[PDB]
Design a protein around this ligand. Structure first.
Ligand SMILES: Cc1cc2nc3c(=O)[nH]c(=O)nc-3n(C[C@H](O)[C@H](O)[C@H](O)COP(=O)(O)OP(=O)(O)OC[C@H]3O[C@@H](n4cnc5c(N)ncnc54)[C@H](O)[C@@H]3O)c2cc1C
Ligand SMILES: Cc1cc2nc3c(=O)[nH]c(=O)nc-3n(C[C@H](O)[C@H](O)[C@H](O)COP(=O)(O)OP(=O)(O)OC[C@H]3O[C@@H](n4cnc5c(N)ncnc54)[C@H](O)[C@@H]3O)c2cc1C
Ligand SMILES: N[C@@H](CCCC[NH3+])C(=O)O
Ligand SMILES: N[C@@H](CCCC[NH3+])C(=O)O
Lengths: 505, 505
């Protein structure tokens, strides 16, 4: 029979819970695991906030929406396996306002926002109304290759990964044969495509974001009615060994002088937990970098990747109202989102409360990058005149000025809100990977390099080509389990892993 | 006589206090001002934390060190006018450890950190030991022009401002005739020169940083004995009209249909404060963006600058010890700083407690960029074992392992520490401007564009070519006062401004 072995799973977000789900399904004789989670809470960046127990009285602080595209089949298979109650998510809705330079969008108007050179701004006239077309020309070849086969498309995209999005647009691609855009044209494309400054990160991440948000297959989107944390609950209930919360790992080691399979250990609260045949670290990389990893003798460039791979920021702000005034008064009847240059940047109309006529949640601000740092500076652990509330109410009034007043929005506000800035969470230290130029092609391979003689895995969304999505976490977890089984030559169970899990079970 | 006129100064950091100091010195008949400061505290990013009232029992949260170089003469003139007790600041000390890849630096040894290709890393052998020389080749031409004349040097530097530092190093400068560096070379230069990821910001900001930290004149450095806040105290005491604290401006307007000079107003807590002939906004740009500025009819690219000009983050962590073990046990007897790839990144040994043998403060961690975001995720408004303290003690022990143990450092630690992450300060929302590629040459001119018919000024360190130093704030405040006097044709007082203030008083 197989000898007794135990493995350590650091972190109980979705990738750690997925590792355990796979091990529980394979039922390998005499194999066990410990899962140590630093937080009192399990689920990580799957985190629904419930204002009350009322059915729809929540918002998702982390993951909230899922496009049904082939490259995310593993995510949807996880949803099926756990019985998630999926409902439609409306990425684009009806009647959602867009507000830039204090003007509302209107279709078939030239330069509705009055930012073109012709109207006294600095955006070139040939770009102001054609951002979508110009970015589809910049990204579209790669998007089509990614749709044919994500991993082959990605490898081809890596041949231009040295460039930022701005660099690609400025120089006309890698040999100057694509259109060349001036600073203000690029600035307007960024303003109309993503968060402030993100075109100074990798071109490849801008391509992949466009692939996921504007996929050639024109996919249906889904959300989990009741919040994404229903998935955490479901994954927890099947665990053979339950999560050990309030266990923050501070060091990971291997004793290369010991002949045993179980020669790895972790330190928690100054105490050694030993006897592990493999350690799967699933934390964000900032949390990993803080650990003492000398005991693992990591390649220096792998250590560089842990420190240096770039993370984006993100902040959410959700308010409760006494009735869904955006539905009733503004005609915003089926979700979507309102985009603006105002501080709140993006106001997301929930897809899960469309038929409610009483209290309703609005995801009034969802921001990335410097926009998220700025809103996040107003988000306090012990919330307080609350400057953030007043900013959001004032921005909401300006964004919905076609139908509402500040006074009526403020009156409808119940005084209950919640906000969260992920860069201020000590258990993540960022929202999610969003790599800088050259990082995917140069640092990422070293992040993914075998370590501790094939017994240590750096797992999670950053350790994948699908940053900022559940699919990246699940892929990364699947691959690590493959490597573990291969390392110990558990061929029956590796064949079973492929049979049952190569697309998600 | 001059007619009665009133101006409004938004913010009482050093910019706003300097505007007031200049007006108080000119004594313009019938001219008054109001200063409104959002915080209960005056001084902004000049902010000394006193642990107790004992003479050296402090650290500076914001500004702390000043190089005596010609372009900063206005700063030193302010120090002189206010009677600041300057003492030497040791940028480089004696016996300060440098720790990378778990190895200490050694002089005259090839690749002491063992990160080069020859030793199993990926840093090119010809770069690993010559970062200083290769960055002096990249920056030095411009550094020398800046030393001749800062404004002419800056205008010449703007002809390559489209590039990031990484882009300049990768492509060999603007026409490919400088040396071209691979990703890992550039990565090591960044690791050995600045904070994580900052080579992906403007080349011009890396040049100016190098100009300030490694100036060709090889300057003396100074600090203010007793803390930089002594300067704020001195500036406050001369004010003819004192700061009005807890007054956060939320809107600024001009009534163009009113003939009066005094046709500007600001809104504070829903109430209008009217009758201003000019408004000087001195806040960080994130705070300005949150205001309702519709009443000023700003050029859209000027509005873009306010939203988009990039800010760096910065975090500081200072610990008290029962004796200065770094002096007594480690021989670190005259200041300087220890750099490392460990999370704390830079440990700054104070220059103001060198003779002390009792309790002493250590600035154990000073970080920028993503390093600051990561440390800042552990900094809590109401502090808590404390993960940040334990991290700092552990990193300090590793950095000082040539002489100290973790146990002795922990035993010397008194249990009193303080930390601060500037991006989490609602009154700033970042540490300081650190522009992205193209921003100085494209967005900054619009930030500085006349507005409200020449009656509105966006003032402060970001509104200058000297980001992240007091000198930028003072130059920006001087320029705005020049523009105010010119706009109202106060030719006697404009001539007096030049006579008395063109180098600082
Ligand atoms: C704002 C936001 C919006 C998102 N939107 C979506 C979306 O709509 N759809 C989608 O598919 N995905 C979305 N995602 C992405 C998705 O939430 C993540 O990719 C995924 O949840 C990450 O899971 P993980 O297991 O890789 O990491 P994590 O969830 O970070 O889990 C790691 C775990 O490790 C723990 N930990 C940290 N340090 C230690 C330590 N020292 N010891 C022990 N445990 C430790 C953490 O507390 C955490 O529980 C979003 C993410 C964010 C931030
Ligand atoms: C970590 C750090 C280290 C530094 N190190 C040095 C150094 O060693 N040497 C050096 O020369 N410089 C240094 N600097 C830079 C220097 O501290 C700053 O450039 C300078 O203090 C900024 O002054 P300011 O008046 O431009 O802005 P601020 O200091 O930000 O002042 C603006 C004021 O406006 C207030 N305000 C904000 N919003 C509103 C509102 N809505 N209504 C009213 N008031 C409002 C703010 O509270 C603040 O008091 C450092 C800065 C940082 C962050
Ligand atoms: N999955 C997240 C982030 C996508 C953008 C990642 N750069 C969302 O749906 O908002
Ligand atoms: N003046 C600050 C910041 C300098 C670097 C700005 N990018 C210091 O001395 O640390």
């Amino acid at each position: 029979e197989l000898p007794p072995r135990k493995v350590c799973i650091v972190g109980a977000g979705v990738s750690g819970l997925y590792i355990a789900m796979i091990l529980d399904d394979l039922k390998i004789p005499n194999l066990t695991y410990d899962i140590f989670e630093s937080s009192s809470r399990t689920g990580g960046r799957l985190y629904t906030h419930h204002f009350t127990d009322a059915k729809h009285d929540y918002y998702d602080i982390g993951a909230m929406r899922y496009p049904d595209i082939p490259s995310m089949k593993r995510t949807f298979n996880l949803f099926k396996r756990t019985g998630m109650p999926l409902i439609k998510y409306y990425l684009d809705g009806e009647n959602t306002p867009q507000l830039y330079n204090n003007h509302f969008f209107a279709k078939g108007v030239v330069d509705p926002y009055m930012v073109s050179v012709a109207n006294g701004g600095t955006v070139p006239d040939d770009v102001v109304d054609s951002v979508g077309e110009k970015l589809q020309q910049a990204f579209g070849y790669y998007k089509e290759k990614l749709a044919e086969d994500f991993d082959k498309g990605f490898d081809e995209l890596m041949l231009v990964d040295d460039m930022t999005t701005r660099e690609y647009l400025k120089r006309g691609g890698p040999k100057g044969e694509a259109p060349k855009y001036d600073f203000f044209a690029i600035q307007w494309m960024e303003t109309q495509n993503t968060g402030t400054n993100l075109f100074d990160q990798a071109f490849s991440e801008s391509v992949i974001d466009s692939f996921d948000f504007d996929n050639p297959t024109k996919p249906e989107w889904y959300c989990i009615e009741g919040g994404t944390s229903l998935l955490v609950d479901a994954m927890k209930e099947t665990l053979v060994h339950k999560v050990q919360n309030n266990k923050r790992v501070e060091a990971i080691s291997i004793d290369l002088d010991a002949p045993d399979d179980g020669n790895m250990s972790v330190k928690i609260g100054g105490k050694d937990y030993s006897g592990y045949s493999t350690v799967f670290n699933t934390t964000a990389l900032g949390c990993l970098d803080r650990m003492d990893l000398r005991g693992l003798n990591l390649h220096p460039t792998q250590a560089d990747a842990i420190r240096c791979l770039h993370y984006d920021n993100s902040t959410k702000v959700a308010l409760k109202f006494s009735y869904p005034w955006w539905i009733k008064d503004c005609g915003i009847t089926c979700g979507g989102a309102a985009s603006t240059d105002l501080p709140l940047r993006t106001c997301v109309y929930p897809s899960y409360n469309l038929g409610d006529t009483g209290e309703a949640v609005l995801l009034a601000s969802y921001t990335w990058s410097q926009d998220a740092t700025r809103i996040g500076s107003l988000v306090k652990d012990a919330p307080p005149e609350d400057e953030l509330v007043e900013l959001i109410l004032q921005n909401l009034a300006r964004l919905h000025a076609e139908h509402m007043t500040y006074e009526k929005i403020k009156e409808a506000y119940t005084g209950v809100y919640h906000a969260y800035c992920w860069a201020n969470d000590p258990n993540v230290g960022g929202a999610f990977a969003l790599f800088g130029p050259g990082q995917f092609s140069n640092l990422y391979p070293y992040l993914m390099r075998p370590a501790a003689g094939g017994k240590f895995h750096i797992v999670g969304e950053a350790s994948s080509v699908h940053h900022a999505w559940i699919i990246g976490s699940l892929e990364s977890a699947y691959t690590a389990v493959y490597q573990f089984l291969y390392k110990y030559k558990m061929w029956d169970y590796l064949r079973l892993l492929l049979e049952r899990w190569q697309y998600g079970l």
